[PDB]
Amino acid sequence: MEGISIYTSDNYTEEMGSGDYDSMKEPAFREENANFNK
Amino acid sequence: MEGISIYTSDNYTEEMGSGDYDSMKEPAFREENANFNK
Amino acid sequence: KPVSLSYRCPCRFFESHVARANVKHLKILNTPNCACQIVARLKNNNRQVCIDPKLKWIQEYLEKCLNK
Amino acid sequence: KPVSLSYRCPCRFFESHVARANVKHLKILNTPNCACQIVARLKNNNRQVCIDPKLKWIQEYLEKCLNK
Numbered sequence: 565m566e567g568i569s570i571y572t573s574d575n576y577t578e579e580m581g582s583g584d585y586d587s588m589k590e591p592a593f594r595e596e597n598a599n600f601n602k
Numbered sequence: 603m604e605g606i607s608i609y610t611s612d613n614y615t616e617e618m619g620s621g622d623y624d625s626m627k628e629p630a631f632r633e634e635n636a637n638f639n640k
Numbered sequence: 641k642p643v644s645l646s647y648r649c650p651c652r653f654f655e656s657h658v659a660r661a662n663v664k665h666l667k668i669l670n671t672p673n674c675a676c677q678i679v680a681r682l683k684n685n686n687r688q689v690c691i692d693p694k695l696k697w698i699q700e701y702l703e704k705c706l707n708k
Numbered sequence: 709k710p711v712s713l714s715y716r717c718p719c720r721f722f723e724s725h726v727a728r729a730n731v732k733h734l735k736i737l738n739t740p741n742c743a744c745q746i747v748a749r750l751k752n753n754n755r756q757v758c759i760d761p762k763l764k765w766i767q768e769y770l771e772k773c774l775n776k
Contacts, residue, residue, distance in 0.1 A: 565772065566772050570670040574670065575643060575751075576733065578643060580688065581650075581651060581652040582652065583653045584653045584655060584656065585656055586655075586657030588694070589692070591696065603704055604707075605701070607661055609665055609737070610662070612683070614712055620758040623724050623725050626760060627762045634764065637764070666737075668769075668773060669734075693774075705761060
């Protein structure tokens with residue numbers, strides 16, 4: 565979370581813009597055996 | 603080191619075998635503030 | 641070479657979930673106004689995809705990298 | 709071309725304590741015979757170098773990437 569810094573100069577050359585794949589999530593730092601959703 | 607499977611065979615195309623920069627290091631999870639060795 | 645248009649994310653849409661068995665490798669690139677932009681290349685499926693850095697397998701990968 | 713059938717790690721040597729001032733972004737590629745392995749693509753002066761993924765700035769970087 566710490567906004568220390570990024571790379572001094574990425575200057576990112578975008579390869580593509582893309583358009584999503586499947587489900588998304590947030591870290592829970594724990595295993596998950598209780599529910600499945602999409 | 604735990605995981606179901608890693609990237610299942612990248613077949614990595616060597617782009618520069620590098621040449622070593624300085625020293626080496628190893629993490630211990632527990633932070634190391636004073637690390638003065640080079 | 642205007643590669644960085646503005647303070648925008650390289651990937652307009654990100655690929656969440658994805659198959660970690662279908663991935664080549666990851667690239668962590670962080671533009672100064674976006675989350676930890678991780679982009680991973682597909683072995684054979686389409687092309688290179690942008691991965692959500694909040695994915696459980698991404699977390700695991702990051703976490704286990706400290707170990708391995 | 710060298711194919712990953714035999715055990716070939718990109719780091720013939722690896723840049724440990726590489727300068728972050730010189731890095732644009734990191735490409736993480738865990739090769740079968742080797743630990744977590746990162747190759748960093750550098751700014752205009754250098755190209756790519758293979759990184760010691762045991763560096764404190766790498767570890768911290770991984771750790772913050774989990775959620776930021």
